[PDB]
């Protein structure tokens with residue numbers, strides 16, 4: 001078969017389709033129109049967007065495809081370097097860092113982050129307890145305060161003190177600007193037009209703000225633990241026998257500060273969004289929180305007891321996976337789905353929100369928010385639900401994000417009643433990652449001591 005392709009713009013081919021503030025949502029609409037696979041061409045570049053579990057299960061075969069750096073990721077390497085997220089699988093620094101840092105996400109490590117997660121979660125509950133009547137909550141803004149602080153504290157013993165700030169923290173402002181610019185770059189026909197001279201200048205200055213903070217974390221540690229930073233500076237890879245060098249460690253820190261919070265903020269924001277729009281689901285989740293979380297602060301074992309809350313989060317990730325795409329390349333010539341020949345090196349994009357809407361897997365009601373879908377996660381076929389990516393290049397922090405989200409959402413649901421007082425219309429902001437923009441609620445305290 002010859003694969004479908006969306007509308008073209010003469011010599012720019014499909015490039016102008018990306019000239020939009022919401023390019024993943026645009027791609028999703030193209031998928032609904034064209035089906036499980038389409039070609040996307042730009043001047044000098046081609047990739048193939050996959051949306052069906054039928055093809056994606058083959059894309060996920062690590063003997064045939066490896067992680068690719070999409071254009072997006074190539075632009076973000078400018079500050080992420082050969083950190084775990086933007087390193088090729090075959091770069092020496094990938095497996096070394098993987099091996100050195102995986103022990104920071106062991107069960108014992110997770111247990112040892114619990115207390116610090118609680119520290120930040122108590123700060124969020126308190127801010128909300130302390131609002132006056134009729135004040136409201138800027139949801140994704142507060143979720144970012146919580147998630148950035150949580151990775152700062154758990155990972156690096158560093159306090160961003162975001163709940164002591166009325167604006168976003170400076171690190172968040174430059175992060176968002178840098179991600180925005182990477183996203184806007186995707187559509188640029190002539191990236192070296194001098195019209196983009198200012199864009200590049202703002203980009204470097206934002207890279208600088210982020211690296212200045214990295215330098216401080218490193219200085220604090222040299223001046224003061226058993227956390228992610230301890231492993232970065234001290235662990236040896238059992239294979240090579242070598243530790244990470246200084247340059248790579250700096251890339252790891254920036255990588256973990258961003259990947260370690262942005263997408264978790266998004267998940268909590270989408271999860272609160274879907275709860276307030278599904279009052280019976282909210283009540284069922286609130287019932288579990290009350291039942292389970294009997295003590296003044298949650299225990300580790302208690303968070304693991306929050307099954308329905310877990311289900312809520314996975315259902316939020318099904319509809320709006322907050323890192324919505326990952327990319328693969330063909331390790332050798334190969335045929336996808338018995339119908340689409342690929343040559344070695346050809347690129348694929350997995351369009352995760354469309355995968356998550358495959359009616360052959362999920363049934364006809366794919367737009368409904370139904371956490372019950374996840375009542376037995378075993379039931380889900382392989383490669384049908386991939387919000388944390390694939391194989392050895394899957395999310396290292398999956399358990400950390402989920403533990404944090406589950407803890408926080410559990411506390412919110414124990415401690416407050418929520419009101420969607422504006423009848424908020426979902427508006428999804430893209431910064432490569434996804435998050436609701438302008439989402440606000442009011443929270444009425446249930447006056448349960450903390």
Ligand code: HEM
Pocket residue numbers: 067084085098255256259260261263264267321322323325326327387388389390392393394395396397398400401
């Ligand atoms: C809901 C929250 C999260 C989502 C949806 C998410 C998603 C993802 C995805 C889709 C990938 C694979 C990317 C690719 O194939 O190009 C990935 C990788 C990664 N994630 Fe996460 N992530 C989340 C939370 C976190 C957290 C909390 C951390 C850190 C504690 C983190 C650290 C990383 C790292 C370092 C990688 C690269 C791993 C490797 O290739 O060795 N993630 N993530």
Ligand SMILES: COc1ccc2nc(SCc3ncc(C)c(OC)c3C)[nH]c2c1
Pocket residue numbers: 018023024070071072076186258259262263322323324325326432433
């Ligand atoms: C058209 O090209 C695109 C567009 C949007 C995209 N969004 C993505 S999601 C890429 C991504 N995944 C996971 C994490 C943890 C992460 O850290 C901030 C990022 C930037 N890739 C894209 C590629």
